[PDB]
């Protein structure tokens, strides 16, 4: 099971051209939101939680209770939590692109011999790194998706293509939630099948 | 510029259930017809052509006159043509996929010191390898799909996706060519940007 669980905020730039925000330096372009962090945690639960490098680098510490799996260049030095800490498990792009395209990969430990399977029966959600997202998306059987909106412009840093919100419109709604988080934010989540 | 390039059958199974036919073993599922080879060169003359480890091997030996890119797993040996000759470059998937997205990667020869730029004014055809070309679509410019339709059943080892047939559909098909092989035999060669 492949679940894709990602947010972003439609916006203007400073000339009024839209834009999709997705990323802020190692932060989001709407901050931190309550009811949004509250969503990501109960649609990841129960869940192998896979990420690039800057996603892992942009947590505070590991999120309780979930295995870390990261996506990246093992040529280079591993990517920790802004608090130290090193995920579960690191995999190359070649793992990953085995995996979500329908093989089975053995993932090991960092700093010790402990490997395990990872296959089509596993319960994973992709979620950081729009790279990541694009490339799962032809494969995943479930699309949660959540779009925060501002009163007012948000920045960015890394954006979305609106083609990749089309195709994921594509797919069948099953599932929409509208929060009003306060006076100039709103937050709706959606699942998709 | 990032074009792919690329050819399936659409046939029926011996139960007459649908399917698209990819490849068959090392070779294609409507084997060798002049006309798609002739295609296949006029598409991929001037490019840089990039694909997977078993479409590499696939080949009897290098096409003339392209610099060939394989993309495959460096810890394994490298896959070779037919005739037993090596690509001018191979890349990891993690280099595949800083390129497509739109980033510049450092290629070197396999034997040799030897090393260049691929970068986003670099043309490139993506040819083989489903999973190749799923993650190439979102980032490419134009796609250059060939149907070959055969009277009676082709057999296949390896078969495409509806969706991304779905997918490419979506974008605005500019050239397209019909031909009358033989008394058994059509072929469409379309052109999406
Ligand atoms: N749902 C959401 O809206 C989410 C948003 N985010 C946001 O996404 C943004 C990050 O996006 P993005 O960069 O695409 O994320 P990814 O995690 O996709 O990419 C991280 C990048 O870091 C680099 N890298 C690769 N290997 C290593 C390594 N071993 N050590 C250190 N760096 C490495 C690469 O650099 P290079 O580019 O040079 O190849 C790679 O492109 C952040 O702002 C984060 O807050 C994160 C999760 C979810
Ligand atoms: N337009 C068309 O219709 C085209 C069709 N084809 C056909 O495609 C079929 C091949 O498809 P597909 O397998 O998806 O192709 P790819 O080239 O996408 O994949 C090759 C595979 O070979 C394996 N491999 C990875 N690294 C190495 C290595 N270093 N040495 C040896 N093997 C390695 C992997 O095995 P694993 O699965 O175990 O991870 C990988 O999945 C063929 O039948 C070919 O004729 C080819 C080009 C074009």
Same mark, same amino acid.
């Given at each position: 099971?492949?679940?894709?669980?990602?947010?972003?905020?439609?916006?203007?730039?400073?000339?009024?051209?839209?834009?999709?925000?997705?990323?802020?330096?190692?932060?989001? $372009?709407?901050?931190?939101?309550?009811?949004?962090?509250?969503?990501?945690?109960?649609?990841?639960?129960?869940?192998?939680?896979? @990420?690039?490098?800057?996603?892992?680098?942009?947590?505070?510490?590991?999120? $309780?209770?979930?295995?870390?799996?990261? *996506?990246?260049?093992?040529?280079?030095?591993? $990517?920790?939590?802004?608090?130290?800490?090193?995920?579960?498990?690191?995999?190359?792009?070649?793992?990953?692109?085995?995996?979500?395209?329908?093989?089975?990969?053995?993932?090991?430990?960092?700093?010790?011999?402990?490997?395990?399977?990872?296959?089509?029966?596993?319960? *994973?959600?992709?979620?950081?790194?729009?790279?990541?997202?694009?490339?799962?998306? $032809?494969?995943?059987?479930?699309? *949660?998706?959540?779009?925060?909106?501002?009163?007012?412009?948000?920045?960015?840093? *890394?954006?979305?293509?609106?083609?990749?919100?089309?195709?994921?419109?594509?797919?069948? @709604?099953?599932?929409?939630?509208?929060?009003?988080?306060?006076?100039?934010?709103?937050?709706?989540?959606?699942?998709?099948?």
């Amino acid at each position: 099971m492949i679940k894709l669980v990602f947010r972003y905020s439609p916006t203007k730039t400073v000339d009024g051209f839209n834009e999709l925000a997705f990323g802020l330096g190692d932060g989001l $372009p709407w901050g931190r939101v309550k009811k949004d962090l509250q969503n990501f945690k109960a649609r990841t639960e129960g869940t192998i939680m896979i @990420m690039g490098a800057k996603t892992f680098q942009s947590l505070p510490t590991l999120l $309780p209770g979930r295995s870390h799996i990261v *996506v990246c260049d093992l040529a280079r030095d591993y $990517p920790v939590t802004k608090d130290g800490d090193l995920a579960h498990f690191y995999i190359t792009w070649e793992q990953y692109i085995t995996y979500i395209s329908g093989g089975e990969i053995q993932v090991s430990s960092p700093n010790a011999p402990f490997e395990t399977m990872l296959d089509q029966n596993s319960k *994973v959600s992709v979620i950081g790194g729009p790279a990541l997202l694009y490339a799962a998306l $032809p494969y995943a059987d479930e699309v *949660v998706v959540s779009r925060i909106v501002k009163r007012h412009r948000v920045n960015s840093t *890394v954006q979305l293509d609106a083609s990749f919100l089309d195709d994921i419109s594509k797919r069948e @709604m099953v599932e929409t939630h509208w929060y009003k988080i306060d006076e100039v934010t709103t937050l709706t989540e959606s699942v998709y099948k």
